[PDB]
Design a binder for these strands. Structure first.
Ligand SMILES: [Cl-]
Ligand SMILES: [Cl-]
Ligand SMILES: [Cl-]
Ligand SMILES: [Cl-]
Ligand SMILES: [K+]
Ligand SMILES: [Mg+2]
Ligand SMILES: [Mg+2]
Ligand SMILES: [Mg+2]
Ligand SMILES: [Mg+2]
Ligand SMILES: [Mg+2]
Ligand SMILES: [Mg+2]
Ligand SMILES: [Mg+2]
Ligand SMILES: [Mg+2]
Ligand SMILES: [Mg+2]
Ligand SMILES: [Mg+2]
Ligand SMILES: [Mg+2]
Ligand SMILES: [Mg+2]
Ligand SMILES: [Mg+2]
Ligand SMILES: [Mg+2]
Ligand SMILES: [Mg+2]
Ligand SMILES: [Mg+2]
Ligand code: NA
Ligand code: NA
Ligand code: NA
Ligand code: NA
Ligand code: NA
Ligand code: NA
Ligand code: NA
Ligand code: NA
Ligand SMILES: [Sr+2]
Ligand SMILES: [Sr+2]
Ligand SMILES: [Sr+2]
Ligand SMILES: [Sr+2]
Ligand SMILES: [Sr+2]
Ligand SMILES: [Sr+2]
Ligand SMILES: [Sr+2]
Ligand SMILES: [Sr+2]
Ligand SMILES: [Sr+2]
Ligand SMILES: [Sr+2]
Ligand SMILES: [Sr+2]
Ligand SMILES: [Sr+2]
Ligand SMILES: [Sr+2]
Ligand SMILES: [Sr+2]
Ligand SMILES: [Sr+2]
Ligand SMILES: [Sr+2]
Lengths: 92, 56, 237, 194
RNA sequence: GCUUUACUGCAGGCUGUCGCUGAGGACUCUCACUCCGGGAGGAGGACACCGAUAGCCGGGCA
RNA sequence: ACUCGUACGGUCACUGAAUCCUGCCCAGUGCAGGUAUCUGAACACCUCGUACAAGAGGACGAAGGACCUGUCAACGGCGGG
RNA sequence: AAACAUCUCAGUAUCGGGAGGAACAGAAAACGCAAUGUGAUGUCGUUAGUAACCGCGAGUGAACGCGAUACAGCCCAAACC
């Protein structure tokens, strides 16, 4: 489906309607220093490694929208529930 | 030839004999080892914890 | 499953050992001080249980009585020489260096003084081709060009017993008697004819290897059966 | 002033440098040709031996022992095991090589008791340690104020019960506080979890 | 119990790397080390063997 | 162990005396060889990050794979129209 | 663990070696009720199923301290001879 790059809506930060810009959330890189990262190294050794021997699951036929909404005046973003959309293309 | 009665007749070999060290008829005269006390195998006396119940 | 026959072998149990207590002697070249001042007289020709070929008993000048890997054409009374100055005659032993290029030799040493390693079987011979100050080139029975230290000793002539392979065994009984003189388990039961538990090829209603026979060099023992690391198979192409 | 000993000591801080480097290169050639336990007239690292209790006296013996380098020489499981207990290659033993060396030395000299030991190098395939052993039955020792303690009955076969300096360290008894909850007073009394 | 391109692992083999290990992206040398030789000595040589680790193969085995 | 053995050897497999013979197929799988380029781990090295370290990225790249070739008395195959 | 691989059963069964009448531990490179504080080590009660671990599942699981028992502190290496 189609969707406007910018449009007026409520900004929970300014607490009033203002223009926002919609952006698909880009994945941020991992640091490899989170607790889970250290548990994988502490608990992995000889033989099977329990949960750390499992491999990536499947995929749902369609994913939900994963967007950021940035307020055009205070520069802050807020998240919203997403909805299943086979495709999301912005207009302009 | 059956493995039972007919094959029992060929048994006239002497293996286990009175042991010099412990007195039991367990000294294998062919191996020269006592299966009861270990004579011929070890200076220490043959012994195992599984010869009795674990907590006893 | 269970270990395959090739694995039972390595344990060296009686079933797989050679009847060594029946073998005659280690036909290694004599060790000479130097000069070649060593000569002996062929005192007798004997049968060698370990190689199905004849061997000659020699009595050396200094009083040593030793069996020798005899070439073809050696008989009682004949005098043999072993040394750097030995005469270039069939039956004499000397370093490749002293040997004229183009002369068939046998019982060629791999490393000077080891006693001989190559060309010792019935009717075979290495062929000395090239000389040099650093390398003597010999063509072995398999046809491969081998580079050897010119100090490696050899016997002039081909090994006795040639053609032993020309006559067929005809009977299983004849194969049997020969096998009893070797370190080998015989007769041979085909892998395909065994149960799956006993061989990679066992199992299945009708007999057939349920897999390709060309196996990788890296395969572990128990799995390395069939055609080992074959570069090719068949007769075609 | 500095003792002559401090010089032997200082040399051994960098066994791979200086004269010591050349000495080791020479010595090991001969050591590789010797047995598993060779009694020696004098310690190779005098400062260390004297520091550990050695004395030039009757009843004091020193022996060099070599052991194969590396991990455990373990036999793979012939019966059923869960992945966890199938390992064979990366498993190492719980006693360090110095301790294995002290025990072989003490077995060679059944009448002597291990006093201490130290390292004298290694090459790519083995390690060497010298072990100080004491004759608890010789009066020169029974009358020594610094060593007679090792003559007591309860010191018999001390090395086989972990009562050595190397034994105690390997048992995790160094620290007196944090980290020693399961090592003191014994590994066994703590259920073998240390 | 058996099978395999079932799951997960383990031996084993191949391969790189570090230690053993020295002197002057291709090279010479000898001194460790290896092999041959009764011995002198010869062959080889910082490689190989061995310890450690990494990648690939891996129903041979669990 | 084989082996007091050395290719006229001995190991690993298949077929199963003699006689007349043994066609076509290398795409898949297996084995083997080669390989400009591609891909390909760790240590060392370089950049960023940390007064250090964790970590992120880079350059290099072995076997292996991609790719090419050989091979069926190698697993096997030789249909429908 | 209602399967099962990490985990559990369990450092249990069993095996190798070794001492004693008891063993082992033990006079701080401790503790960290953080203090102007405690003062070798076992053990008992408690701290506590607490902190911590863990397909964060099932399960596993201390310590400091405190109240007791009993109390005990010393000897080398080196410097200088
Ligand atoms: Cl989206
Ligand atoms: Cl044959
Ligand atoms: Cl002792
Ligand atoms: Cl306190
Ligand atoms: K289990
Ligand atoms: Mg011979
Ligand atoms: Mg036989
Ligand atoms: Mg057959
Ligand atoms: Mg059958
Ligand atoms: Mg099988
Ligand atoms: Mg068939
Ligand atoms: Mg004093
Ligand atoms: Mg040798
Ligand atoms: Mg299985
Ligand atoms: Mg058939
Ligand atoms: Mg048949
Ligand atoms: Mg269950
Ligand atoms: Mg206790
Ligand atoms: Mg569950
Ligand atoms: Mg537990
Ligand atoms: Mg604490
Ligand atoms: Na851990
Ligand atoms: Na002893
Ligand atoms: Na069954
Ligand atoms: Na094909
Ligand atoms: Na259950
Ligand atoms: Na079950
Ligand atoms: Na767990
Ligand atoms: Na208090
Ligand atoms: Sr761990
Ligand atoms: Sr693992
Ligand atoms: Sr799906
Ligand atoms: Sr029968
Ligand atoms: Sr009958
Ligand atoms: Sr009988
Ligand atoms: Sr015996
Ligand atoms: Sr016992
Ligand atoms: Sr020989
Ligand atoms: Sr020899
Ligand atoms: Sr089959
Ligand atoms: Sr053909
Ligand atoms: Sr004793
Ligand atoms: Sr035929
Ligand atoms: Sr092919
Ligand atoms: Sr006190």
């Amino acid at each position: 489906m189609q969707m406007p790059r910018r449009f007026n809506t409520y900004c929970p930060h300014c607490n009033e309607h203002q223009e926002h810009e919609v952006e698909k959330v880009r994945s941020g890189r991992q640091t490899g220093m989170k607790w889970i990262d250290r548990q994988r190294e502490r608990n992995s050794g000889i033989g099977n490694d329990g949960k750390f021997s499992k491999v990536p699951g499947g995929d749902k036929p369609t994913k939900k929208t994963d967007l950021k909404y940035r307020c055009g005046e205070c520069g802050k973003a807020h998240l919203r529930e997403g909805w299943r959309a086979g495709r999301l293309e912005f207009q302009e | 030839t059956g493995a039972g009665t007919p094959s029992q007749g060929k048994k006239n070999t002497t293996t286990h004999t009175k042991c010099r060290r412990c007195g039991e008829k367990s000294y294998h005269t062919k191996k020269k080892v006592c299966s009861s006390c270990g004579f011929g195998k070890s200076a220490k006396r043959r012994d195992y914890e599984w010869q009795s119940k674990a907590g006893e | 499953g269970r270990r395959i026959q090739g694995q039972r072998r390595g344990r060296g149990t009686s079933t797989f050992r050679a009847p060594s207590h029946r073998y005659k002697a280690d036909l290694e070249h004599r060790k000479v001080e130097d000069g070649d001042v060593i000569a002996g007289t062929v005192v007798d020709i004997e049968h060698d249980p370990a190689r199905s070929a004849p061997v000659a008993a020699v009595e050396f000048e200094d009083g040593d009585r030793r069996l020798i890997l005899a070439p073809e054409g050696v008989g009682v009374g004949d005098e043999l020489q072993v040394g750097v100055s030995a005469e270039i005659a069939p039956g004499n032993t000397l370093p490749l260096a002293e040997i004229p290029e183009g002369v068939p030799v046998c019982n060629v040493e791999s490393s000077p003084g080891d006693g001989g390693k190559f060309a010792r079987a019935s009717g075979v011979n290495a062929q000395l081709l090239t000389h040099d100050r650093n390398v003597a080139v010999v063509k072995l029975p398999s046809g491969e060009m081998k580079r050897l230290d010119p100090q490696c000793r050899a016997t002039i002539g081909v090994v006795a017993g040639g053609g032993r392979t020309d006559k067929p065994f005809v009977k299983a009984g004849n194969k049997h008697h020969k096998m009893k003189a070797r370190g080998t388990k015989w007769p041979n039961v085909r892998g395909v004819a065994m149960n799956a538990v006993d061989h990679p090829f066992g199992g299945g209603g009708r007999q057939h290897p349920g897999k390709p026979k060309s196996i990788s060099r890296n395969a572990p023992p128990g799995r390395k059966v069939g055609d080992i690391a074959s570069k090719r198979t068949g007769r075609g192409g | 002033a500095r003792s002559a000993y401090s010089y032997i000591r200082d040399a051994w801080e960098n066994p791979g440098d200086g004269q010591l480097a050349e000495l080791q290169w020479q010595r090991q050639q001969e050591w590789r040709n010797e047995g598993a336990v060779e009694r020696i007239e004098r310690p190779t690292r005098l400062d260390k031996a004297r520091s550990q209790g050695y004395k030039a006296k009757q009843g004091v013996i020193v022996a060099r022992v070599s052991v194969r380098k590396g991990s455990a020489r373990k036999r793979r499981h012939k019966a059923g095991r869960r992945s966890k207990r199938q390992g064979v290659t990366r498993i190492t033993r719980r006693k360090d090589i110095q301790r294995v060396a002290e025990e072989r030395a003490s077995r060679t000299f059944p009448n002597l008791r291990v006093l201490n030991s130290y390292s004298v190098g290694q090459d790519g395939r083995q390690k060497w340690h010298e072990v100080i052993l004491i004759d608890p039955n010789h009066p020169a020792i029974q009358n020594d104020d610094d060593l007679s303690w090792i003559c007591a009955d309860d010191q018999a076969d001390r090395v086989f019960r972990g009562l050595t300096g190397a034994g105690r360290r390997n048992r995790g008894l160094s620290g007196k506080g944090k980290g020693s909850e399961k090592t003191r007073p014994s590994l066994r009394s703590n259920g073998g979890k240390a």
